[PDB]
Design a binder for this molecule. Structure first.
Ligand SMILES: *[C@H]1O[C@H](CO)[C@@H](O)[C@H](O)[C@@H]1O[C@@H]1O[C@H](CO)[C@@H](O)[C@H](O)[C@H]1NC(C)=O
Ligand code: NA
Ligand code: NA
Lengths: 150, 5
């Protein structure tokens, strides 16, 4: 199994696999949105890493087009930095739901969200915290879960 | 870049 850690918050995201951090971003000016990592399901190696600023218009379309080309079976990791919902439209939301995500489809303004799941298979872990007020953010969430190698 | 509200 892979030891996977996924952190989502206003100011910082990080992802680690088996003790190696494969993503860390705590910029103010950059990195906003949904960070997406694709792992090889047999080795845990990172095959692709992206960030879609879904706070901004049309970035969710790019995320959908990227997710479309991921082979069924790959491990997906999603994590929000700062804000990932403002221009997250219904098609992207529906796609995340079809990926088995509970909170993705329901993602709201300045919510936090961390997700690990196989494309075409089960979810391995998910956490979500709601912003309590418009000028506030969801509570940071720290998801630590085991991912079985295929 | 739009901002609420
Ligand atoms: C958009 O700008 C408004 C001021 O013009 C703020 O009151 C809103 O809260 C929005 O603020 C922007 O929020 C995003 C998402 O949290 C953040 O990444 C931007 O830095 C922030 N922009 C500003 C100017 O506060
Ligand atoms: Na936060
Ligand atoms: Na504000």
């Amino acid at each position: 199994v892979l030891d996977v850690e996924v952190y989502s918050s206003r100011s910082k995201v990080y992802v680690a696999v088996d003790g190696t951090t494969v993503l860390e971003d705590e910029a103010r000016e950059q990195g906003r949105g949904i960070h997406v990592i694709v792992l090889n399901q047999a080795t845990g190696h990172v095959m692709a890493k992206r960030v879609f600023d879904t706070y901004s218009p049309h970035e969710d379309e790019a995320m959908v087009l990227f997710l479309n080309m991921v082979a069924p079976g790959r491990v997906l990791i999603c994590t929000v930095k700062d804000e990932g919902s403002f221009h997250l439209k219904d098609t992207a939301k529906a796609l995340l739901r079809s990926l088995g995500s509970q909170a993705g489809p329901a993602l709201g303004w300045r919510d936090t969200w961390a997700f690990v799941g196989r494309k075409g298979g089960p979810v391995f872990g998910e956490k979500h915290s709601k912003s309590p007020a418009l000028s506030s953010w969801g509570d940071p969430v720290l998801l630590k879960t085991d991912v079985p190698l295929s | 870049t739009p901002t609420p509200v």
